[PDB]
Design a protein around this ligand. Structure first.
Ligand SMILES: CN[C@@H]1[C@@H](O)[C@@H](O[C@@H]2[C@@H](O)[C@H](O[C@H]3O[C@H](CN)CC[C@H]3N)[C@@H](N)C[C@H]2N)OC[C@]1(C)O
Ligand SMILES: [Mg+2]
Length: 268
């Protein structure tokens, strides 16, 4: 029988989600199983679990981000530049590969959306505006991003059947790690500025592998290696949400662990 909102809420409470919490979910809907009213059932349950003073932050990105199409170029290629849609935060759909739940999160009434087209973050709750801005090109997951503020806001990472590769917040550790050989990428995004499309070219840390040895197309990247180690070494509440094995992780703690992990392994 499909899971009801009430059942999910009680499961989230059992796992340790409390009213007022700041939660970043990573969800495998296949692992969760059938829901009474589809993915919205779990969105509603998350909102109810954090309560009217809690907050949700999700890494939603953009279905049509021209990342691969502009990667490595000092300017968007001519055909891309001419016709690509500008990122419109009110209308741009989420990137399906980070989870089908994210399109439901970002369309929730009152959801706020960050301005970085490729790293776009969605937030629901009283602190949503403070979470989502600024989010500038060149600051995807590191200092000054919504992840940085989440990590300062008692954030908890709620992994619902998702693997250790899924922990976006660990890209902050990569950004700040004092290690040699860090990979950077250059790409271009089309933004709206006073109603007009403006192409912005930037560089940032490579979110597909911070060092060469972490950059194989099919991983494991450093996020995955850090998170697997962390979960083998740390008490973390575990339990079901729907049919999915889930975990509730202190975000500041895993990020600090990840900074230390990288700096212990790689010369400065
Ligand atoms: C939406 N554009 C995205 C772009 O943001 C980026 O996405 C990466 C994504 O590939 C990474 O994750 C992906 O690759 C990992 C191995 N490198 C394993 C997990 C897999 N989801 C995330 N950890 C960080 C995102 N910014 O590279 C892929 C892409 C599709 O172009
Ligand atoms: Mg508050």
């Amino acid at each position: 029988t499909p899971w009801s909102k009430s059942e999910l809420v009680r499961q989230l409470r059992d796992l340790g989600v409390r009213s007022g919490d700041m939660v970043m979910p990573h969800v495998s809907l296949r692992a969760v199983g059938p829901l009474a009213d589809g993915p919205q059932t779990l969105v509603d349950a998350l909102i109810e679990a954090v309560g009217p003073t809690g907050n949700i932050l999700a890494f939603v990105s953009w279905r049509d981000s021209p990342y691969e199409q502009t990667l490595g170029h000092d300017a968007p290629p001519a055909a891309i530049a001419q016709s690509w849609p500008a990122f419109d935060p009110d209308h741009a759909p989420a990137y399906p590969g980070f989870g089908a739940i994210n399109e439901f999160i970002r369309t929730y009434p009152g959801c706020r959306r960050s301005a970085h087209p490729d790293a776009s973050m969605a937030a629901i709750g009283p602190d949503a505006a403070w979470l989502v801005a600024p989010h500038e090109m060149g600051a995807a997951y590191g200092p000054r991003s919504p992840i940085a503020r989440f990590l300062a806001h008692a954030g908890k990472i709620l992994s619902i059947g998702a693997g250790p590769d899924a922990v976006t917040a660990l890209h902050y550790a990569e950004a700040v790690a004092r290690i040699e050989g860090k990979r950077r990428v250059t790409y271009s995004m089309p933004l709206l500025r006073e109603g007009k499309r403006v192409w912005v070219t930037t560089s940032d840390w490579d979110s597909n592998g911070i060092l060469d040895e972490y950059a194989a197309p099919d991983g494991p990247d450093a996020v995955e290696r850090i998170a697997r180690d962390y979960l083998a070494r740390t008490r973390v509440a575990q339990g079901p949400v729907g049919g999915a094995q889930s975990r509730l992780i202190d975000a500041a703690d895993i990020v600090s662990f990840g900074i230390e992990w990288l700096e212990a392994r790689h010369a400065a």
